[PDB]
CSV table of N, CA and C in Angstrom, one decimal:
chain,number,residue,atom,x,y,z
A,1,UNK,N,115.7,150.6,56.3
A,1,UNK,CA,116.0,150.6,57.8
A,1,UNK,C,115.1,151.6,58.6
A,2,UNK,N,115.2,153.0,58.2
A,2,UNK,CA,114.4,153.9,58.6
A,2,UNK,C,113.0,153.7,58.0
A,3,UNK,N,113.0,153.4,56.7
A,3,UNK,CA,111.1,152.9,56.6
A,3,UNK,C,110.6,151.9,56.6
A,4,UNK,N,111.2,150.9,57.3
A,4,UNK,CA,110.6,149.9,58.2
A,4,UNK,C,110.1,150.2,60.1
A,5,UNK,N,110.8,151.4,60.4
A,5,UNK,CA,110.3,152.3,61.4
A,5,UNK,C,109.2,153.4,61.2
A,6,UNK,N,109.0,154.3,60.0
A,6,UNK,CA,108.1,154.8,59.9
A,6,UNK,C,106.8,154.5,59.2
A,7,UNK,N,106.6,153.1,58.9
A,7,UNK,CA,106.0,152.0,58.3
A,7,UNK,C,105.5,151.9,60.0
A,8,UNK,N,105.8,151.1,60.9
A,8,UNK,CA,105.5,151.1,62.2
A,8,UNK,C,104.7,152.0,62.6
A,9,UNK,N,105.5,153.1,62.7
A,9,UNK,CA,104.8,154.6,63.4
A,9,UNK,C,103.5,154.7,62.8
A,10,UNK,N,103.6,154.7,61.6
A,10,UNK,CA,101.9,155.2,61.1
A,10,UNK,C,101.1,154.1,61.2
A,11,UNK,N,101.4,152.6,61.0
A,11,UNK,CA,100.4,151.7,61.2
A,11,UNK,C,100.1,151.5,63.0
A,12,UNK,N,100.8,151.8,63.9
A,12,UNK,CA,100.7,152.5,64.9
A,12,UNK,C,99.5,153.6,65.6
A,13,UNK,N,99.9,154.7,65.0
A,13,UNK,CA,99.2,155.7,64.6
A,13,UNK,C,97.7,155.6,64.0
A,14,UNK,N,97.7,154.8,63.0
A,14,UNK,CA,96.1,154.5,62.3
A,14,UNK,C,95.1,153.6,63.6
A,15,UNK,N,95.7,152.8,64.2
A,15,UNK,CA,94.9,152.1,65.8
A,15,UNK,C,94.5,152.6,66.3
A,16,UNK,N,94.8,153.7,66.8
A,16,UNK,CA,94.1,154.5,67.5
A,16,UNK,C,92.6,154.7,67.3
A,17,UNK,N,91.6,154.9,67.9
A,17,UNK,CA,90.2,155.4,67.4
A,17,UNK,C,90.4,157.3,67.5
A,18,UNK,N,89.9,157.2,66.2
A,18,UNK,CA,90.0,158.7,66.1
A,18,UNK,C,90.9,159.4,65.0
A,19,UNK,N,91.8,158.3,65.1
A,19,UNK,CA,92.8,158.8,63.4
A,19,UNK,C,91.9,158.3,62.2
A,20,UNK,N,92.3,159.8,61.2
A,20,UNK,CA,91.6,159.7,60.5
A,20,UNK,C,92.6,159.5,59.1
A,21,UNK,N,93.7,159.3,59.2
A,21,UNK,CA,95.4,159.0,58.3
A,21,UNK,C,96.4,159.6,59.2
A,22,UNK,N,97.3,159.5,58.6
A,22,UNK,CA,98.6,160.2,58.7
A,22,UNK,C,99.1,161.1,58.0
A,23,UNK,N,98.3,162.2,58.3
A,23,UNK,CA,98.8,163.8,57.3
A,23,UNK,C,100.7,164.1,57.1
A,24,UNK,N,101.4,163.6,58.2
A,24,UNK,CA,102.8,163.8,58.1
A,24,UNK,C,103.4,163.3,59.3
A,25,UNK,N,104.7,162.5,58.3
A,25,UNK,CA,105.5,162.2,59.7
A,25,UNK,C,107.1,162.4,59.1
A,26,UNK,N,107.4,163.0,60.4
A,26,UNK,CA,109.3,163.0,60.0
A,26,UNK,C,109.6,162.3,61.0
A,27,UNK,N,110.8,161.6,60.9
A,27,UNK,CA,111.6,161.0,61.6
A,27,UNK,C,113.0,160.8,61.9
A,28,UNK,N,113.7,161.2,62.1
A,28,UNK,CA,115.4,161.2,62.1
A,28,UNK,C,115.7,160.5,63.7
A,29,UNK,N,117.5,160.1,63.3
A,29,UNK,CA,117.6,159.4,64.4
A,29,UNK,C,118.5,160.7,64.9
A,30,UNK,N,118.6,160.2,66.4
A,30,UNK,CA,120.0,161.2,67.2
A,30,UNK,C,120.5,160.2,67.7
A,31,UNK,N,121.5,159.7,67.5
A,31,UNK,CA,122.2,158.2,67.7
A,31,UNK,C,121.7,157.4,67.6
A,32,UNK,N,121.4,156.6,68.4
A,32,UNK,CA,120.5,155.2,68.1
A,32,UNK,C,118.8,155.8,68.5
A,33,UNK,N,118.7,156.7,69.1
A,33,UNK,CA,117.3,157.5,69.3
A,33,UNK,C,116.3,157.7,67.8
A,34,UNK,N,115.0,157.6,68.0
A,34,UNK,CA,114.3,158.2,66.7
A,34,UNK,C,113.7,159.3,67.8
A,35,UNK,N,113.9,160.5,66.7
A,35,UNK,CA,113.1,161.8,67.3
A,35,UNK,C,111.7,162.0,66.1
A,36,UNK,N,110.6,162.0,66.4
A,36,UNK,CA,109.4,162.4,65.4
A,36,UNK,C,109.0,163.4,65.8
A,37,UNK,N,108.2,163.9,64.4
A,37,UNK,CA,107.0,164.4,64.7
A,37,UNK,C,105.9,164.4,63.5
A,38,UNK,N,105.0,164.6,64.4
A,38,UNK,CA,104.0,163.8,62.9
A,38,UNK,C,102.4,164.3,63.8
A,39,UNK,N,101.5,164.8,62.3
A,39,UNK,CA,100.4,165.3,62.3
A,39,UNK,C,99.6,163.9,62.0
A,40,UNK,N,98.4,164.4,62.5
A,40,UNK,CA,96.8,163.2,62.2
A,40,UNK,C,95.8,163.9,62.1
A,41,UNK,N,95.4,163.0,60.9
A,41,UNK,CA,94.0,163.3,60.7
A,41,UNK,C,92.8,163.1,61.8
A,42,UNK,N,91.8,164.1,62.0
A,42,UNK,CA,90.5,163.8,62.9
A,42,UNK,C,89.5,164.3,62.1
A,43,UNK,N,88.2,163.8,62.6
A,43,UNK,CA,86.8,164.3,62.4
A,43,UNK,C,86.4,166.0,62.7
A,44,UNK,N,86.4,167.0,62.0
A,44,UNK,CA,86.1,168.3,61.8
A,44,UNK,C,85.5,168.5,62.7
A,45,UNK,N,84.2,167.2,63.5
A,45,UNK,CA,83.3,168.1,64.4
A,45,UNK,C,83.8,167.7,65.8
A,46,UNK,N,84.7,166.9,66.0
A,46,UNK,CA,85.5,166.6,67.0
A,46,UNK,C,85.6,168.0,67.8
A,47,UNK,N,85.4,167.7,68.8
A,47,UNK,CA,85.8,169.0,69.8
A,47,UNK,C,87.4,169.6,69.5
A,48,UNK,N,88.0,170.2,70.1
A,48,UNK,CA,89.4,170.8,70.2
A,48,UNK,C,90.3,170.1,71.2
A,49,UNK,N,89.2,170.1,72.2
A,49,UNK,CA,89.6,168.7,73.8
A,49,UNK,C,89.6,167.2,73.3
A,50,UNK,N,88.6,167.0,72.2
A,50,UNK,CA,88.8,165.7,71.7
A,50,UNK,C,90.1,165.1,71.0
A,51,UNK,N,90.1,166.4,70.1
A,51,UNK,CA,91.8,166.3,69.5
A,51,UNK,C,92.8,165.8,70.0
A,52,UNK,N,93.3,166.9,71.1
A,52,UNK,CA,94.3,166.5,72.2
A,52,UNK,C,94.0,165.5,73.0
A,53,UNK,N,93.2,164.5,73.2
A,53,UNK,CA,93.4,163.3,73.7
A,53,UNK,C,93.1,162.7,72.8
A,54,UNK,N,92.7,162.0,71.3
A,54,UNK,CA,93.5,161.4,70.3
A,54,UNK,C,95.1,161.4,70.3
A,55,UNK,N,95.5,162.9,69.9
A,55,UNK,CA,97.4,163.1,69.9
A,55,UNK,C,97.6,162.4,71.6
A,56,UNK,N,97.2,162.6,72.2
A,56,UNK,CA,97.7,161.6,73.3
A,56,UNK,C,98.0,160.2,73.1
A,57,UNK,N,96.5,159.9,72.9
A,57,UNK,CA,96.6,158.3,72.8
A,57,UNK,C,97.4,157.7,71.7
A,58,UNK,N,97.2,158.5,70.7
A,58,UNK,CA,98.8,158.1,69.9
A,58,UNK,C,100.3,158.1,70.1
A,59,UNK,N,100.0,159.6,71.0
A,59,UNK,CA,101.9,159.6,71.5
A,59,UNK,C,102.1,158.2,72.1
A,60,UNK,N,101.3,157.6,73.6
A,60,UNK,CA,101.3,156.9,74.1
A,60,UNK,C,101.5,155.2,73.5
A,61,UNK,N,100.5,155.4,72.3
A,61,UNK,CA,100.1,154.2,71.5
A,61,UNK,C,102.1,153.8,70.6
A,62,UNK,N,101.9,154.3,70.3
A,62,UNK,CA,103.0,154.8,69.0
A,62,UNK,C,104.6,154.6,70.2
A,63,UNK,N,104.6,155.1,71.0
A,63,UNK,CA,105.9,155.2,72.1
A,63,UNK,C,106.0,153.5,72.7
A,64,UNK,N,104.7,153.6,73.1
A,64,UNK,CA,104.8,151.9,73.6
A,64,UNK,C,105.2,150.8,72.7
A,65,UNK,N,105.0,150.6,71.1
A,65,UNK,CA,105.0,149.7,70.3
A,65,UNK,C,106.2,150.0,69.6
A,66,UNK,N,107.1,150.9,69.6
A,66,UNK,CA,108.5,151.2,68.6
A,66,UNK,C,109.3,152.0,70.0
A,67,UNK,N,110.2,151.0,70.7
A,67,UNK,CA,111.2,151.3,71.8
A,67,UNK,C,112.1,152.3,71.5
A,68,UNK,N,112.6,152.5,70.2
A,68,UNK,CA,113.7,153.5,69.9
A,68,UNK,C,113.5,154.5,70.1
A,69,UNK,N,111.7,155.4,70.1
A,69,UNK,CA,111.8,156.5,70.0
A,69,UNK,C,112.0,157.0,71.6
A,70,UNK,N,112.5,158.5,71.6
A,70,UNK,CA,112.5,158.8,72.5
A,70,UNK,C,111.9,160.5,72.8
A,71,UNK,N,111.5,160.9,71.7
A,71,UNK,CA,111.0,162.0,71.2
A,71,UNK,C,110.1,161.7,70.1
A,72,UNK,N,108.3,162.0,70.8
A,72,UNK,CA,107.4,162.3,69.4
A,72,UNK,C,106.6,163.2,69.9
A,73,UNK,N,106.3,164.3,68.7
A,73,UNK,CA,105.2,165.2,69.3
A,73,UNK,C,104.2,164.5,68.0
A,74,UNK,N,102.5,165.0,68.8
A,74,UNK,CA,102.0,164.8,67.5
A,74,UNK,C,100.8,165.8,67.9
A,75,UNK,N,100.6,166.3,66.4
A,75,UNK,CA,99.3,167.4,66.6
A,75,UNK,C,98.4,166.7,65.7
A,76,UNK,N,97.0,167.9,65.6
A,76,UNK,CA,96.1,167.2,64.4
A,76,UNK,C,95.5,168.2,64.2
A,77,UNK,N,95.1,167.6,62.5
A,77,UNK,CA,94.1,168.9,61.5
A,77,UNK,C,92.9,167.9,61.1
A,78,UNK,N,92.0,169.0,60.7
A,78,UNK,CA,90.5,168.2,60.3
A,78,UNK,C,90.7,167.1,59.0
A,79,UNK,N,90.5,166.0,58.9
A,79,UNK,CA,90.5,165.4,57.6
A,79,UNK,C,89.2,164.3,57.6
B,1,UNK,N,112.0,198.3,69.1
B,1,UNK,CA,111.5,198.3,67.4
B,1,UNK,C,110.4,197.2,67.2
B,2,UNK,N,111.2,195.8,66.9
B,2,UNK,CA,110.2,194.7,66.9
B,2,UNK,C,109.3,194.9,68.4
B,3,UNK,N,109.8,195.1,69.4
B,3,UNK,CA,108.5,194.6,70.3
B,3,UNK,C,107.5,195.3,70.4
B,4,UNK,N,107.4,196.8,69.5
B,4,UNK,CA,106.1,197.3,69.0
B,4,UNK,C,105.6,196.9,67.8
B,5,UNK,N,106.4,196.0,66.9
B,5,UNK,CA,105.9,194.8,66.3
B,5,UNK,C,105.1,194.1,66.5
B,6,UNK,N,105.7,193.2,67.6
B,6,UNK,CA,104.6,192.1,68.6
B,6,UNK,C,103.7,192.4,69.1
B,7,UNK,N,104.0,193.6,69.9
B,7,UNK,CA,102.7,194.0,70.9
B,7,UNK,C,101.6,194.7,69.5
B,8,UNK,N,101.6,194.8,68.5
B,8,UNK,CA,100.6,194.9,67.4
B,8,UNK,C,99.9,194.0,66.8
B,9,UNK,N,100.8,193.2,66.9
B,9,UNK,CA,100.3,191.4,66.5
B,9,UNK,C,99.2,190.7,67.3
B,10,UNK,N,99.9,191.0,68.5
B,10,UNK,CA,99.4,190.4,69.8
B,10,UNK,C,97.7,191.1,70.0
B,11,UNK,N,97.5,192.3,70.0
B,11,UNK,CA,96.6,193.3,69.7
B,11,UNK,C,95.6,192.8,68.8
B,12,UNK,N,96.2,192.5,67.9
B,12,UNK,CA,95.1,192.3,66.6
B,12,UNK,C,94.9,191.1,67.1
B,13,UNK,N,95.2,190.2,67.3
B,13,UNK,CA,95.0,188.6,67.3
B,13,UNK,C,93.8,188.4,68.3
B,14,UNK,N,93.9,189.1,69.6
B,14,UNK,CA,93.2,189.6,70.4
B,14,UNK,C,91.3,190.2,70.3
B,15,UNK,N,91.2,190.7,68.8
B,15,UNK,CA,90.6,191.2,69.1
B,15,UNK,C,89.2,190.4,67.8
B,16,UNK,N,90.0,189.1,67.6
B,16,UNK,CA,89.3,188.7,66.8
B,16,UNK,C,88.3,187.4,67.6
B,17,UNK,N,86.7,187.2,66.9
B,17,UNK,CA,85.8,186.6,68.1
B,17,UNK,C,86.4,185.2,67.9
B,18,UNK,N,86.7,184.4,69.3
B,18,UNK,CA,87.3,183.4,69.8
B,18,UNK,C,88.7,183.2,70.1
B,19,UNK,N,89.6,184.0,70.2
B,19,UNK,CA,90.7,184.1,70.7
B,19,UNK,C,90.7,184.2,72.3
B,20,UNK,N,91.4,183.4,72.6
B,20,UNK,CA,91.3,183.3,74.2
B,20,UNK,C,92.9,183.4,74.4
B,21,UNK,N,93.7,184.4,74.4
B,21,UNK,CA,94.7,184.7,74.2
B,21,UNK,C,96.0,184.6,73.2
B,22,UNK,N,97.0,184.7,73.4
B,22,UNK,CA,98.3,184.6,72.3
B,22,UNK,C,98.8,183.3,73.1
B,23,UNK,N,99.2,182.5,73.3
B,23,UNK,CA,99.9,181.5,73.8
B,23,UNK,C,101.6,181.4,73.5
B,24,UNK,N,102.1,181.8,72.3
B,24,UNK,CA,103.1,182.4,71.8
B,24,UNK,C,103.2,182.6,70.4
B,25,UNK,N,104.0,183.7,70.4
B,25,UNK,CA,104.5,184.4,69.4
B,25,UNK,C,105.5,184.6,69.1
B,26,UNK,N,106.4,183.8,67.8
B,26,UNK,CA,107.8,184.6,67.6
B,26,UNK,C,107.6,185.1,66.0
B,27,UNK,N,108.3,186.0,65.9
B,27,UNK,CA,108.3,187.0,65.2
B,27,UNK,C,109.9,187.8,65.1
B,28,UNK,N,110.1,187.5,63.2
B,28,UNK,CA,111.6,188.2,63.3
B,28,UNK,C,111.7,188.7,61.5
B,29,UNK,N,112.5,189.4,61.5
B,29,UNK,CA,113.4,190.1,60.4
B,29,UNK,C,114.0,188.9,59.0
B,30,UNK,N,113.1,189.2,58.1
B,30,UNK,CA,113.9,189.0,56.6
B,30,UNK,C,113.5,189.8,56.1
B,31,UNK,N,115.2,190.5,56.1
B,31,UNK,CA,114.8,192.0,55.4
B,31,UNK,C,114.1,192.6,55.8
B,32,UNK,N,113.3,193.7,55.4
B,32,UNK,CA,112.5,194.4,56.1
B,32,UNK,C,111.0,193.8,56.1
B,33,UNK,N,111.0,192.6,56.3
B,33,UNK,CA,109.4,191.9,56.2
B,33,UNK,C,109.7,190.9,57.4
B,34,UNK,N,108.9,191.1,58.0
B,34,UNK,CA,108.7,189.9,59.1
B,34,UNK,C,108.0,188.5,58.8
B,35,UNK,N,108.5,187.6,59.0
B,35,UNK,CA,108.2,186.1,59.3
B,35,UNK,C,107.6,186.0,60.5
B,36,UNK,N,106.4,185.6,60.7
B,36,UNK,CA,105.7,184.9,62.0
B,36,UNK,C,105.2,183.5,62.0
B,37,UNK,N,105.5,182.8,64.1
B,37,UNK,CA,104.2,181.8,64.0
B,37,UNK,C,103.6,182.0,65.2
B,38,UNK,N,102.5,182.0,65.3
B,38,UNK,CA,101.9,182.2,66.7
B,38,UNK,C,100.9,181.0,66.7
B,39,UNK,N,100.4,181.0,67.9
B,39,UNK,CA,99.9,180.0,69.0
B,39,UNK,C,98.9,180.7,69.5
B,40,UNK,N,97.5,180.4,69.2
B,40,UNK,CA,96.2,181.3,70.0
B,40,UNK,C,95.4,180.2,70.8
B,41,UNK,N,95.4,180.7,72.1
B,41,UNK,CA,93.8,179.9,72.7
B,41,UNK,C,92.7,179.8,72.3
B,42,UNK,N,92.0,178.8,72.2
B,42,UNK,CA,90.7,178.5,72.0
B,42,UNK,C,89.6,177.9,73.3
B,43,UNK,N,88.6,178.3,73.4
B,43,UNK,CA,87.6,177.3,74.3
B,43,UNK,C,87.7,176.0,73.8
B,44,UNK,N,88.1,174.8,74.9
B,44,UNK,CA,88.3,173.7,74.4
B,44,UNK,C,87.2,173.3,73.8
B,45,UNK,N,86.0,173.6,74.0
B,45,UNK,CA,84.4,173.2,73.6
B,45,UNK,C,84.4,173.6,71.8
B,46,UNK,N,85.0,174.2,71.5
B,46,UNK,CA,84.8,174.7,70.2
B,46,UNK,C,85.5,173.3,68.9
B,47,UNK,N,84.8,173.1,68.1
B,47,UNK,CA,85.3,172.0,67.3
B,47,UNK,C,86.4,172.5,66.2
B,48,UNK,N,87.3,171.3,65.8
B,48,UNK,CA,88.7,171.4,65.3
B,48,UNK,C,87.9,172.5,63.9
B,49,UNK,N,87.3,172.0,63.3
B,49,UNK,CA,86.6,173.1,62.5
B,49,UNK,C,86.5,174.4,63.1
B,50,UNK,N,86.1,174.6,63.4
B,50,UNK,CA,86.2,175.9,63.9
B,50,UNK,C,87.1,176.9,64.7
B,51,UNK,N,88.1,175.8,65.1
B,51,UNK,CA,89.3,176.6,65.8
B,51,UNK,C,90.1,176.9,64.3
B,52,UNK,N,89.8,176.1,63.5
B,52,UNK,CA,90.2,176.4,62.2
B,52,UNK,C,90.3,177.5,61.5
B,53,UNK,N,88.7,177.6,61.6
B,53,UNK,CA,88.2,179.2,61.1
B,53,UNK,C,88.5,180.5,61.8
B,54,UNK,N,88.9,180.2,63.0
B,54,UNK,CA,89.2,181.4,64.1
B,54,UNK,C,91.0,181.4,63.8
B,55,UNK,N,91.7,180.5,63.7
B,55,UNK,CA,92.6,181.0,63.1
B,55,UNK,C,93.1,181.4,61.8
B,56,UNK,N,92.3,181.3,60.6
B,56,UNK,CA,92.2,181.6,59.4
B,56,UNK,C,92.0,183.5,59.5
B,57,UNK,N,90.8,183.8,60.8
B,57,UNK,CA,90.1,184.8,60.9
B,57,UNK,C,91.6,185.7,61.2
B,58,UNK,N,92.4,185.4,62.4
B,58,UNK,CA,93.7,186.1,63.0
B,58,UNK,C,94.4,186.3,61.7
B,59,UNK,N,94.9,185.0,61.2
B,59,UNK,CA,95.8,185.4,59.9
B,59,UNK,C,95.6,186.9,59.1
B,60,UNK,N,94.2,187.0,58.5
B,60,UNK,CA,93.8,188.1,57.9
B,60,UNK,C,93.0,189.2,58.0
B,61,UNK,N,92.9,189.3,59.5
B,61,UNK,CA,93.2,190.3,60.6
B,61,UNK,C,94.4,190.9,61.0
B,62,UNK,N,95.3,190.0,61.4
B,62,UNK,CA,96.7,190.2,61.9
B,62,UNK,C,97.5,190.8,60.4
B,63,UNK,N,97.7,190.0,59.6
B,63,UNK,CA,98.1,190.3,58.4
B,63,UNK,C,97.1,191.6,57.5
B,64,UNK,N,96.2,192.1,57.7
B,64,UNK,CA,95.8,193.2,57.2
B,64,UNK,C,95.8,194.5,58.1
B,65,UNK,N,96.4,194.5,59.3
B,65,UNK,CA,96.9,195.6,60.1
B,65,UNK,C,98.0,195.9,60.3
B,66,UNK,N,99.1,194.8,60.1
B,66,UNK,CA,100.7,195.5,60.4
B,66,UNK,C,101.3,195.0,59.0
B,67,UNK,N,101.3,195.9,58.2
B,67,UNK,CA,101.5,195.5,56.6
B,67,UNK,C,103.1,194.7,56.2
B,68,UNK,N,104.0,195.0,57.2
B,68,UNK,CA,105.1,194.6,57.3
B,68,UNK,C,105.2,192.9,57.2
B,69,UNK,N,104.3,192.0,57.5
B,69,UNK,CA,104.3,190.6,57.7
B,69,UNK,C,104.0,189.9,56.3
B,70,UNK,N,105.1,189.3,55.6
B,70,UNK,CA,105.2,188.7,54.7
B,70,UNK,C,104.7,186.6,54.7
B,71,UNK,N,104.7,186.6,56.0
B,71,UNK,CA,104.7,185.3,56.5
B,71,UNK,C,104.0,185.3,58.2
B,72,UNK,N,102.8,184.0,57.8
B,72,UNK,CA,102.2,184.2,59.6
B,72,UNK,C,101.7,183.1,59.5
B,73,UNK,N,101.6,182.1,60.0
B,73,UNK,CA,101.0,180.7,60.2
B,73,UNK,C,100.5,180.9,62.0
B,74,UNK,N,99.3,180.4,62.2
B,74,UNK,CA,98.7,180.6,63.4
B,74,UNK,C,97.7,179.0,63.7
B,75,UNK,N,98.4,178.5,64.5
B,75,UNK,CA,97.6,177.3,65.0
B,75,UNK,C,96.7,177.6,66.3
B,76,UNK,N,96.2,176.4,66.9
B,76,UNK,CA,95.3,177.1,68.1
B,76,UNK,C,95.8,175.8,69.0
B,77,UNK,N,95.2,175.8,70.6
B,77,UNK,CA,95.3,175.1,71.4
B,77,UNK,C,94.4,175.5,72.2
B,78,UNK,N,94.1,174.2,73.1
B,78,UNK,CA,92.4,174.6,74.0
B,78,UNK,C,93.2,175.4,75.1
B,79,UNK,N,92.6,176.6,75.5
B,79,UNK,CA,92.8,177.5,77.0
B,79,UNK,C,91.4,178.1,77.7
């Protein structure tokens, strides 16, 4: 039930241009809510500004295609 | 007590090349060894690599000046 949702989230997550995998994702529900948070891989020579709008475009990407969630942060490390 | 803790932390983190401030800092008591995580500015221009190495640099700066810190994890963000 829940990893048919975070099955979602990461194939989600990988569309984006710029993800480089899915280093971590947690997911719990708060009632019927999913709350995440979950790290991505990027390219090392990516700027630091580049970063943060990848994790954008994923929050965005990822929030739009799985309605439950109502809480996602996402950061990223070099991979 | 602790907040001549922090403001030592805060100091060191400061004084290492590419820190563009503390963004936050918590810092607390197990036992007599502190647990930290801080949050340092970076130039957003600077690549995910290398905000990498500028926080690597804080870690063992910060952690080789206030001997008390058993634990310090330091991420960055563009400022």
């Amino acid at each position: 039930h829940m990893e048919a949702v975070q099955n979602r989230i990461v194939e989600a997550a990988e569309r984006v241009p710029g993800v480089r995998g899915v280093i971590h994702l947690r997911a719990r529900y708060v009632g019927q809510d999913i709350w995440a948070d979950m790290i991505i891989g990027v390219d090392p020579e990516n700027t630091v500004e580049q970063a943060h709008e990848i994790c954008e475009a994923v929050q965005a990407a990822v929030c739009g295609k799985i309605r439950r969630i109502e809480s996602l942060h996402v950061s990223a490390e070099a991979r």
